Tab-separated table of C-alpha atoms and ligand atoms in Angstrom:
chain	number	residue	atom	x	y	z
C	1	UNK	CA	66.063	151.929	55.714
C	2	UNK	CA	67.336	151.774	59.306
C	3	UNK	CA	69.590	148.871	60.341
C	4	UNK	CA	69.680	149.636	64.062
C	5	UNK	CA	67.592	148.012	66.788
C	6	UNK	CA	67.301	150.842	69.367
C	7	UNK	CA	64.949	149.119	71.815
C	8	UNK	CA	65.681	148.304	75.429
C	9	UNK	CA	65.216	144.586	76.228
C	10	UNK	CA	62.274	143.585	78.389
C	11	UNK	CA	61.850	140.062	79.719
C	12	UNK	CA	58.930	138.180	81.256
C	13	UNK	CA	58.799	134.653	82.629
C	14	UNK	CA	56.414	132.405	80.673
C	15	UNK	CA	55.788	128.728	81.620
C	16	UNK	CA	59.209	128.458	83.252
C	17	UNK	CA	61.080	130.118	80.387
C	18	UNK	CA	62.051	133.726	79.704
C	19	UNK	CA	60.750	135.584	76.664
C	20	UNK	CA	62.128	138.879	75.320
C	21	UNK	CA	59.958	141.723	74.004
C	22	UNK	CA	60.128	145.318	72.800
C	23	UNK	CA	57.855	147.607	74.854
C	24	UNK	CA	57.639	151.298	73.809
C	25	UNK	CA	54.994	153.987	73.540
C	26	UNK	CA	52.491	155.285	76.106
C	27	UNK	CA	51.384	153.043	78.963
C	28	UNK	CA	47.644	153.619	78.539
C	29	UNK	CA	45.217	152.910	75.703
C	30	UNK	CA	44.917	149.804	73.586
C	31	UNK	CA	48.317	148.193	72.992
C	32	UNK	CA	49.466	147.088	69.557
C	33	UNK	CA	50.947	143.576	69.618
C	34	UNK	CA	53.447	142.808	66.783
C	35	UNK	CA	53.994	139.105	65.974
C	36	UNK	CA	56.925	138.065	63.754
C	37	UNK	CA	57.308	134.742	61.912
C	38	UNK	CA	59.982	132.487	60.372
C	39	UNK	CA	62.987	133.074	60.424
C	40	UNK	CA	62.786	136.581	61.926
C	41	UNK	CA	62.358	138.218	65.363
C	42	UNK	CA	61.107	141.571	66.679
C	43	UNK	CA	63.954	142.962	64.516
C	44	UNK	CA	61.587	142.738	61.504
C	45	UNK	CA	59.352	145.410	63.119
C	46	UNK	CA	62.186	147.851	63.950
C	47	UNK	CA	61.252	150.425	61.267
C	48	UNK	CA	57.481	150.060	61.612
C	49	UNK	CA	57.158	150.483	65.395
C	50	UNK	CA	58.476	154.109	65.369
C	51	UNK	CA	55.475	155.185	63.264
C	52	UNK	CA	53.071	153.753	65.864
C	53	UNK	CA	54.856	154.403	69.212
C	54	UNK	CA	53.907	158.149	69.400
C	55	UNK	CA	50.245	157.235	69.895
C	56	UNK	CA	50.183	153.573	71.005
C	57	UNK	CA	51.967	151.138	73.263
C	58	UNK	CA	53.939	148.771	70.993
C	59	UNK	CA	54.735	145.237	72.263
C	60	UNK	CA	56.904	143.004	70.063
C	61	UNK	CA	57.862	139.639	71.572
C	62	UNK	CA	60.419	137.234	70.230
C	63	UNK	CA	58.727	133.833	69.779
C	64	UNK	CA	60.026	131.098	72.102
C	65	UNK	CA	63.249	129.672	70.657
C	66	UNK	CA	63.855	132.820	68.561
C	67	UNK	CA	65.316	136.315	68.901
C	68	UNK	CA	66.459	136.995	72.460
C	69	UNK	CA	63.872	134.626	73.989
C	70	UNK	CA	64.969	131.438	75.735
C	71	UNK	CA	65.671	128.238	73.779
C	72	UNK	CA	64.319	125.176	75.619
C	73	UNK	CA	64.734	121.701	74.154
C	74	UNK	CA	61.321	121.694	72.422
C	75	UNK	CA	60.158	120.453	69.054
C	76	UNK	CA	58.809	123.999	68.404
C	77	UNK	CA	55.564	122.742	66.911
C	78	UNK	CA	52.934	125.359	66.200
C	79	UNK	CA	51.215	123.985	69.375
C	80	UNK	CA	54.282	124.999	71.402
C	81	UNK	CA	54.264	128.546	70.014
C	82	UNK	CA	50.523	128.798	70.754
C	83	UNK	CA	51.129	127.737	74.366
C	84	UNK	CA	53.914	130.250	74.954
C	85	UNK	CA	52.229	133.145	73.120
C	86	UNK	CA	48.974	132.550	75.041
C	87	UNK	CA	50.909	132.645	78.298
C	88	UNK	CA	52.971	135.659	77.172
C	89	UNK	CA	49.795	137.703	76.574
C	90	UNK	CA	48.396	136.777	79.993
C	91	UNK	CA	51.748	137.384	81.731
C	92	UNK	CA	51.704	141.016	80.524
C	93	UNK	CA	48.059	141.266	81.612
C	94	UNK	CA	46.823	142.484	78.229
C	95	UNK	CA	43.060	142.931	77.917
C	96	UNK	CA	42.033	144.256	74.478
C	97	UNK	CA	44.696	144.485	71.761
C	98	UNK	CA	45.251	145.451	68.147
C	99	UNK	CA	47.213	142.744	66.290
C	100	UNK	CA	49.949	143.461	63.681
C	101	UNK	CA	50.970	140.067	62.359
C	102	UNK	CA	53.128	138.371	59.714
C	103	UNK	CA	53.811	134.752	58.447
C	104	UNK	CA	53.736	132.316	61.441
C	105	UNK	CA	52.967	135.377	63.584
C	106	UNK	CA	49.722	135.679	61.658
C	107	UNK	CA	48.802	132.033	62.368
C	108	UNK	CA	49.370	132.761	66.074
C	109	UNK	CA	47.434	136.030	65.930
C	110	UNK	CA	44.421	134.730	63.966
C	111	UNK	CA	44.222	131.600	66.108
C	112	UNK	CA	44.309	133.745	69.253
C	113	UNK	CA	41.698	136.152	67.834
C	114	UNK	CA	39.318	133.305	66.944
C	115	UNK	CA	39.499	132.130	70.576
C	116	UNK	CA	39.373	135.651	72.120
C	117	UNK	CA	37.201	137.614	69.674
C	118	UNK	CA	36.014	140.190	72.245
C	119	UNK	CA	39.635	141.243	72.921
C	120	UNK	CA	40.751	142.044	69.340
C	121	UNK	CA	39.965	145.618	68.261
C	122	UNK	CA	41.677	145.325	64.859
C	123	UNK	CA	44.048	143.158	62.833
C	124	UNK	CA	46.730	144.393	60.436
C	125	UNK	CA	48.286	141.482	58.557
C	126	UNK	CA	50.595	140.690	55.647
C	127	UNK	CA	52.064	137.636	53.920
C	128	UNK	CA	50.032	135.456	56.246
C	129	UNK	CA	49.398	131.747	56.608
C	130	UNK	CA	46.362	130.388	54.750
C	131	UNK	CA	45.700	126.860	53.448
C	132	UNK	CA	47.716	126.121	50.299
C	133	UNK	CA	45.526	123.499	48.572
C	134	UNK	CA	48.178	122.096	46.189
C	135	UNK	CA	51.843	122.675	45.491
C	136	UNK	CA	50.779	124.538	42.329
C	137	UNK	CA	49.504	127.292	44.654
C	138	UNK	CA	53.030	127.706	46.094
C	139	UNK	CA	55.314	130.113	44.160
C	140	UNK	CA	57.134	128.144	41.489
C	141	UNK	CA	60.541	129.643	42.326
C	142	UNK	CA	60.261	128.384	45.944
C	143	UNK	CA	58.599	125.005	45.265
C	144	UNK	CA	61.651	122.718	45.048
C	145	UNK	CA	63.289	124.319	48.103
C	146	UNK	CA	60.282	124.098	50.416
C	147	UNK	CA	59.570	120.568	49.208
C	148	UNK	CA	63.102	119.632	50.265
C	149	UNK	CA	62.661	121.536	53.564
C	150	UNK	CA	59.720	119.218	54.310
C	151	UNK	CA	61.845	116.113	54.659
C	152	UNK	CA	63.638	114.918	57.769
C	153	UNK	CA	67.033	113.992	56.369
C	154	UNK	CA	67.511	116.535	53.528
C	155	UNK	CA	65.443	119.325	55.124
C	156	UNK	CA	67.359	119.172	58.416
C	157	UNK	CA	70.680	119.056	56.584
C	158	UNK	CA	69.712	122.209	54.656
C	159	UNK	CA	68.125	124.176	57.488
C	160	UNK	CA	70.008	123.034	60.575
C	161	UNK	CA	73.454	121.960	59.286
C	162	UNK	CA	73.780	124.482	56.439
C	163	UNK	CA	71.577	127.290	57.861
C	164	UNK	CA	69.894	127.698	54.461
C	165	UNK	CA	66.732	129.379	55.843
C	166	UNK	CA	68.844	132.260	57.214
C	167	UNK	CA	71.563	132.494	54.534
C	168	UNK	CA	69.405	131.717	51.487
C	169	UNK	CA	65.648	131.784	51.996
C	170	UNK	CA	65.532	134.918	54.152
C	171	UNK	CA	67.331	137.225	51.652
C	172	UNK	CA	65.283	135.554	48.926
C	173	UNK	CA	62.190	136.862	50.763
C	174	UNK	CA	63.177	140.534	50.244
C	175	UNK	CA	63.344	142.372	46.923
C	176	UNK	CA	66.046	144.796	48.071
C	177	UNK	CA	69.445	143.427	49.181
C	178	UNK	CA	69.780	142.989	52.927
C	179	UNK	CA	72.927	144.611	54.288
C	180	UNK	CA	75.581	142.691	56.225
C	181	UNK	CA	74.502	144.483	59.433
C	182	UNK	CA	70.891	143.390	58.842
C	183	UNK	CA	71.994	139.811	58.059
C	184	UNK	CA	74.031	139.679	61.279
C	185	UNK	CA	70.979	140.751	63.298
C	186	UNK	CA	68.941	137.952	61.713
C	187	UNK	CA	71.858	135.513	62.159
C	188	UNK	CA	72.484	136.288	65.837
C	189	UNK	CA	69.893	133.960	67.487
C	190	UNK	CA	70.991	130.983	65.362
C	191	UNK	CA	74.810	131.078	65.424
C	192	UNK	CA	74.704	127.744	67.291
C	193	UNK	CA	73.428	125.008	64.899
C	194	UNK	CA	71.543	123.138	67.650
C	195	UNK	CA	69.331	126.226	68.111
C	196	UNK	CA	67.917	126.062	64.570
C	197	UNK	CA	65.114	123.579	65.412
C	198	UNK	CA	62.282	126.152	65.016
C	199	UNK	CA	63.597	127.128	61.585
C	200	UNK	CA	63.081	123.546	60.392
C	201	UNK	CA	59.840	122.676	62.194
C	202	UNK	CA	58.058	125.798	60.883
C	203	UNK	CA	58.105	124.918	57.129
C	204	UNK	CA	57.130	121.348	58.094
C	205	UNK	CA	54.031	122.820	59.791
C	206	UNK	CA	52.988	124.826	56.705
C	207	UNK	CA	49.442	123.767	55.588
C	208	UNK	CA	50.346	122.629	52.060
C	209	UNK	CA	48.491	120.012	50.007
C	210	UNK	CA	46.487	118.914	53.030
C	211	UNK	CA	49.459	118.189	55.361
C	212	UNK	CA	50.033	118.366	58.232
C	213	UNK	CA	46.295	117.709	58.670
C	214	UNK	CA	46.128	119.195	62.188
C	215	UNK	CA	47.545	122.539	61.019
C	216	UNK	CA	45.309	122.596	57.926
C	217	UNK	CA	42.237	122.168	60.151
C	218	UNK	CA	43.314	124.916	62.552
C	219	UNK	CA	44.116	127.364	59.735
C	220	UNK	CA	40.791	126.623	57.982
C	221	UNK	CA	38.975	127.341	61.254
C	222	UNK	CA	40.528	130.767	61.767
C	223	UNK	CA	39.986	131.728	58.111
C	224	UNK	CA	36.335	130.753	58.634
C	225	UNK	CA	36.195	132.937	61.760
C	226	UNK	CA	37.939	135.787	59.924
C	227	UNK	CA	35.314	135.762	57.147
C	228	UNK	CA	32.601	135.887	59.845
C	229	UNK	CA	34.083	138.645	61.992
C	230	UNK	CA	33.246	142.353	61.792
C	231	UNK	CA	36.676	143.181	63.248
C	232	UNK	CA	38.475	145.988	61.351
C	233	UNK	CA	41.106	144.531	59.037
C	234	UNK	CA	44.133	146.006	57.264
C	235	UNK	CA	45.845	143.827	54.625
C	236	UNK	CA	49.247	144.736	53.152
C	237	UNK	CA	50.352	142.957	49.983
C	238	UNK	CA	53.201	143.147	47.487
C	239	UNK	CA	54.036	141.931	43.982
C	240	UNK	CA	54.578	139.078	43.435
C	241	UNK	CA	54.297	138.096	47.136
C	242	UNK	CA	54.951	134.548	48.357
C	243	UNK	CA	52.210	133.356	50.721
C	244	UNK	CA	49.681	135.829	49.295
C	245	UNK	CA	49.825	136.547	45.537
C	246	UNK	CA	48.082	139.750	44.340
C	247	UNK	CA	45.002	137.914	43.039
C	248	UNK	CA	44.469	136.349	46.466
C	249	UNK	CA	44.875	139.698	48.242
C	250	UNK	CA	42.304	141.158	45.836
C	251	UNK	CA	39.896	138.314	46.648
C	252	UNK	CA	40.392	138.619	50.424
C	253	UNK	CA	39.993	142.403	50.318
C	254	UNK	CA	36.364	141.812	49.220
C	255	UNK	CA	35.497	138.576	51.031
C	256	UNK	CA	36.718	139.653	54.462
C	257	UNK	CA	34.308	142.059	56.198
C	258	UNK	CA	35.561	145.558	57.017
C	259	UNK	CA	38.893	145.055	55.219
C	260	UNK	CA	41.180	147.752	53.839
C	261	UNK	CA	43.962	146.570	51.519
C	262	UNK	CA	47.202	148.460	50.802
C	263	UNK	CA	49.551	147.772	47.880
C	264	UNK	CA	53.165	148.157	49.085
C	265	UNK	CA	54.753	147.842	45.626
C	266	UNK	CA	57.390	145.172	44.944
C	267	UNK	CA	57.585	142.608	47.701
C	268	UNK	CA	58.017	138.931	48.440
C	269	UNK	CA	57.556	137.739	52.030
C	270	UNK	CA	59.254	140.256	54.399
C	271	UNK	CA	57.227	143.201	53.125
C	272	UNK	CA	58.456	145.123	56.190
C	273	UNK	CA	61.961	145.135	54.740
C	274	UNK	CA	60.939	146.494	51.327
C	275	UNK	CA	58.566	149.349	52.352
C	276	UNK	CA	58.584	149.895	56.142
C	277	UNK	CA	57.602	153.565	55.923
C	278	UNK	CA	54.413	152.876	53.973
C	279	UNK	CA	53.432	149.969	56.245
C	280	UNK	CA	54.214	151.888	59.453
C	281	UNK	CA	52.504	155.090	58.282
C	282	UNK	CA	49.383	153.257	57.091
C	283	UNK	CA	49.121	151.276	60.347
C	284	UNK	CA	49.446	154.441	62.425
C	285	UNK	CA	46.767	156.284	60.399
C	286	UNK	CA	44.461	153.240	60.328
C	287	UNK	CA	44.748	152.970	64.128
C	288	UNK	CA	43.407	156.525	64.343
C	289	UNK	CA	40.357	155.608	62.206
C	290	UNK	CA	39.476	152.829	64.665
C	291	UNK	CA	38.396	155.575	67.098
C	292	UNK	CA	35.952	157.173	64.627
C	293	UNK	CA	32.278	156.148	65.013
C	294	UNK	CA	31.324	157.180	61.466
B	301	LIG	C1	56.415	131.459	54.242
B	301	LIG	C2	57.492	131.335	55.248
B	301	LIG	C3	58.610	132.376	54.981
B	301	LIG	C4	58.940	132.527	53.496
B	301	LIG	C5	60.343	133.217	53.358
B	301	LIG	C6	60.610	133.788	51.963
B	301	LIG	O1	60.545	132.740	51.044
B	301	LIG	C7	61.207	133.028	49.835
B	301	LIG	C8	61.280	131.700	49.036
B	301	LIG	O2	62.636	131.193	49.064
B	301	LIG	C9	62.872	130.087	48.207
B	301	LIG	C10	64.339	130.018	47.892
B	301	LIG	O3	64.987	129.470	49.037
B	301	LIG	C11	66.335	129.751	49.172
B	301	LIG	C12	67.032	129.653	47.810
B	301	LIG	N1	68.233	128.830	48.000
B	301	LIG	C13	68.745	127.916	47.096
B	301	LIG	C14	69.895	127.369	47.717
B	301	LIG	C15	70.850	126.304	47.149
B	301	LIG	N2	70.697	125.029	47.867
B	301	LIG	C16	69.257	124.859	48.288
B	301	LIG	C17	68.610	123.657	47.592
B	301	LIG	C18	69.165	122.360	47.397
B	301	LIG	N3	68.207	121.631	46.739
B	301	LIG	N4	67.164	122.407	46.549
B	301	LIG	N5	67.356	123.614	47.035
B	301	LIG	C19	71.579	125.044	49.034
B	301	LIG	C20	72.297	123.687	49.212
B	301	LIG	C21	73.618	123.467	49.791
B	301	LIG	N6	73.820	122.123	49.739
B	301	LIG	N7	72.753	121.538	49.191
B	301	LIG	N8	71.837	122.447	48.869
B	301	LIG	N9	69.982	127.997	48.952
B	301	LIG	N10	68.993	128.840	49.076
B	302	LIG	CL1	58.134	128.534	57.365
C-alpha cells in the first residue's frame, strides 16, 4: 500500500480563503469529486485516485481548516464546511459531477446532492454519516471515547491538547497498522495545537441520540432524498465497520434505489487504508457502467 502523495498542489480562492486540491486525469468528461472526512485530507484518496485518473478527471479538495487548505479562525461547524465546499465547487466551475465520499465528506456530498440533484451523475460512498438513534447504535468499543469527545472541557483536552483523534482514534479506524510515514502525513496539518479545532467540532456535530438537533434534521433530509433518488449508487462496506455495520449496509443496499454494494473485507472507518485497490478498481469499473444505457 503506497505511502507517497505524488500530486502537484492546486489552489483556488474560496470566500477569501485558499483551499488546496488534487487535480489529475483528463480535462474533459464528467469529473469525479473525492470528499474526505475527519481527521483526514486528500491523502486518504492517494491510492484510489490512480485507478480512476486514466479515464476521469479526479478532484480531491482538502476541507477548509484541514490538509493544505487555509486555517481561518472559524468554529468549523458543519455549516462552515457546507459554505466553503459549495463555493469550492462553483469556483472550479463544475457542472455535473460523480461524488466519491467518506465520513463527514459524505455528509457534505449528500447534502450537496439533495440541493443539486440534476448535477450528480452517481455517488460512491463508504462509512458515511447517517442518524445514530441511540448510543447503543454506536460501536461499543468507541462509545466511551466519543462520549468524552462530546464534552467541552474533557473533549477539547483530549482532541486539542493531547491530539487523541490523530494519535489514537485515527489508527484505531484502520485494521492494518499505519506506518510512521503515513502517520506523519496525517499529522502534518495539525502539528500546531491551535489548528485542531475542526477535529473537535466534527465529533460534536455527529447526529447521535438526537443531538445536535440541527445536524440530525439535515442528515435525515438527505437520507430521505437518497431513498427517493434514482441516482446510481455504489456502497463500500467492511467488517465490522464503525459508522455502517454490515447489517446496515445490507439494509441500505436494498432500500436505496439503483445501489450496488461491495464488501471490502475487514475494515473499520478508513476503508481506503485497508483495501484501496478493491475500492479504486470497483469505482473505476462502475464509472464505466454509468455510460451504458442497458
Ligand atoms: C466517524 C468519524 C471517524 C471515526 C474514526 C475511527 O473511529 C474508530 C473509533 O475509535 C475509538 C477509539 O478512540 C481512540 C482510542 N483511544 C483511547 C485512548 C486513551 N485515552 C482516551 C480516553 C480517555 N478516556 N476515555 N478515552 C487517552 C487519554 C490521555 N489522557 N486522558 N485520556 N486514546 N485513544
Ligand atoms: Cl467525527
